[PDB]
């Protein structure tokens, strides 16, 4: 096909063990994480990629799995953009609370609406949240105006903003030919997932991707996929 | 106090122990190359440093020297830009040769003049050197142009190529009240050194610059340093240094 692009989830979190929603709270991989991501990166290399560019979140669970997978490939030399775009969906006032727990706390159809819902965002993390200074009022976000600041995001807002990402600063780098890796979340990759292949909102909740294993896309020159995502690594 | 500069040569590479001219070959860090980094890091955390973007080479001992910083600061997610204008020294031919082996192949005196001159460059890396192809070839260097993409520098022709490079990109982000990490090489580190400094050509090549220590700069608005360089670390770490 005309251009190959190649996305990863970040391997598996801390607080995926511990079973709490982590959003936009900057949780690092676990160390089975960091071996999944290790795996990635080895399969990549086992298949000979090279890349030109790689995008990735300002979160260190992406950021990290991105830099074990450059270790692997030996191409740590290559030019990284991070962005907030690119961040895991904000899961506002859930953000820390044990997921089985707030199962147990609002029953099960509320909870599959904050989980699996296209437009229905959770709470708002309000300033009496626990994580509200530690991620509302991280410098890393400094630069983002009062509006751009999630207190709160449904898949949909996710996308929403991801998606004028990719189409003003990864789109341009791929019609150039420029190889490019994106390293970042299930809930960012989804909205490029669904952007890629035309999927219905139905079809997009119903999509997991697995943590810490590169997916292929085959474009051809309008971006559309030749053929379905192929996963790499071993059977 | 106008601003705050933070520079860091790489930690320690694999070569250095064999005294071997690594160059633009893509060593990596030793063992206790990593230590350094780490002690580094940690450093910087406990001194509470804070930074708003990075620069590097394109050379992984610096670059996994920067990682390493940036994980024991918890700022992994700076943004970080690359240059090849950062690299270490091209040794040219002399690449991938120890001090002894470079003597053998090219005797004493050319070897000590190579040694010792500012702006006398080592012989070229030509089409039959084990690294040709390996740093020539390499994709990382394919945007240099023909005339741009060095086959020997000495530390001149370094310093001529890495001072554009702050001028153009790093001076003005320092300027917009942004805090500068630069994670790079000895001598490339010289020619910023030596410009913030004013240091003569003689002095710059005596200037030790230690692998893995941060390396702190108070810059008055015009970049000038009111006070010297302070190496940052624990006590052993600072005493080696000194
Ligand atoms: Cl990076």
Redesign the interface.
């Known amino acids: 096909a005309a251009y190959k692009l190649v996305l990863i989830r970040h391997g598996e979190s801390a607080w995926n063990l511990e079973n709490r929603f982590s959003g936009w709270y900057?949780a690092d991989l676990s160390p089975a994480g960091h071996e999944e991501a290790k795996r990635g990166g080895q399969a990549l290399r086992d298949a000979g990629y090279?890349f030109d560019i790689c995008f990735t979140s300002?979160?260190?669970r992406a950021?990290?799995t991105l830099?074990t997978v450059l270790?692997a490939i030996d191409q740590?030399?290559?030019?990284?953009?991070?962005t907030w775009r690119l961040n895991e969906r904000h899961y506002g006032g859930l953000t820390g609370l044990n997921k089985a727990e707030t199962a147990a706390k609002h029953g099960e159809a509320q909870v599959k609406i904050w989980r699996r819902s296209y437009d229905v965002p959770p709470p708002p993390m309000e300033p009496d949240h626990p994580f509200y200074s530690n991620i509302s009022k991280d410098?890393?976000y400094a630069d983002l105006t009062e509006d751009q600041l999630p207190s709160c995001e449904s898949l949909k807002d996710t996308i929403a903003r991801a998606l004028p990402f990719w189409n003003e600063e990864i789109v341009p780098q791929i019609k150039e030919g420029k190889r490019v890796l994106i390293a970042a979340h299930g809930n960012s990759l989804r909205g490029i997932v669904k952007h890629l292949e035309g999927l219905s909102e139905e079809a997009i909740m119903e999509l997991n991707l697995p943590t810490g294993i590169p997916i292929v896309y085959e474009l051809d020159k309008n971006l559309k996929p030749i053929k379905p995502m192929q996963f790499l690594g071993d059977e």
Do not use: S
């Open positions: 900057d090279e300002v979160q260190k950021i990290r830099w270790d740590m030399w290559l030019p990284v953009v991070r410098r890393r």
